[PDB]
Symmetry: C8
Subunit: 62 residues, 8 copies
């Protein structure tokens, strides 16, 4: 890993979308633009997380 970035993008394909978010070096952020999603997808994984599970993930990525 040469990027200096550890984390992942997350979104849900279920009923109540929250858009795309990411953990970037242990900091959670919202992503506003699809360009940015595509850019980060070059260096970090992009996974699915249900809206109901986001809270628990945040606890673990705290």
């Amino acid at each position: 890993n040469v990027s200096g970035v550890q984390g992942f993008l997350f979104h849900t394909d279920g009923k109540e979308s929250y858009g795309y978010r990411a953990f970037i070096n242990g900091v959670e952020i919202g992503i506003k633009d699809i360009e940015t999603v595509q850019g980060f997808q070059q260096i970090i994984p992009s996974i699915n997380i249900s809206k109901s599970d986001v809270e628990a993930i945040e606890k673990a990525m705290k």
Copy 2:
């Protein structure tokens, strides 16, 4: 490495399910939705642990 996540998903296929759980960076969580299970299966392993063995694993992961 790049995901910023070390850990694993665990469940039992035995007669009394406890659903899916995970250790994520040393923190134990419940996972509510199968979307989230499949998301995390892209970046961390997913193993079987019997209901009777969860206690010892929880203690070892302390």
Copy 3:
């Protein structure tokens, strides 16, 4: 290693079986169910240790 687990399963195929055990991040545990053995075999090695040698291994894995 993405699991956050270092260690191994151990058992003997000799006269006085002690079932399966494991070292998980330097903590020794008994394993009650074969499901759990199979699960851990996905992420950590599974080796043979004679009953007579368990005591010495415990000293080294202390």
Copy 4:
């Protein structure tokens, strides 16, 4: 590893360019010349970040 540089180049292809920027060993810089962009592209990744998302990434990389 061998370069002594962890980080990435970022730019947007959107309507209002901010040129190329980089995080180099946790320090954010502007890059003035495309020669330098192509030089750094030999050793670190180069991704797209929208203008609207730069703020959050800057905060996360703090």
Copy 5:
């Protein structure tokens, strides 16, 4: 890496055996049973050390 064990087995094939010994995470132990030798041979190397050379190796591994 994943085993949580760094070290090696040692023995001599010379005229006076000292059996099998091991350094396991910096701790020297005797191994009593060949089952255990073969178990550990799945995860750590197994080398020859003459009886006359064991002393110096023990000191170096201090």
Copy 6:
């Protein structure tokens, strides 16, 4: 990396050449001889940096 050296050579192919320079374990040096450039090219990357960008790179490689 077995060399004990992290860094890179840099030069520009643009108007105002500054010759070859390098960062070697976070220390910037001028290189006087092409032999030395060729030698370091065996163990560290060699990239292009415009004269106008050298100042900003020095800030990040400080």
Copy 7:
């Protein structure tokens, strides 16, 4: 490296042999038996060092 040993065997093929020696985790030792040389050759490199250079190497491996 799973052995827990870093170093090398050394000998000279020149006029004034000093037998085989080794650095084992920064400790210099003489090796008395060829069996031991063969054993260590399974886990660490074996190189040539002239008798005249041993003193300088010892300084660096101190």
Copy 8:
């Protein structure tokens, strides 16, 4: 990794030789004999550095 040696050999092929030198675990040494040069070439890189550039490299490796 396994050798316990990080560094490199250096020499010039220019008109005034300084022989072979090495940085071995951050310590600069002279090498007297070509046997030793070839021994170390099995485990660490060997590069060219002009006589005029040795000073700057020595300072950088401080």
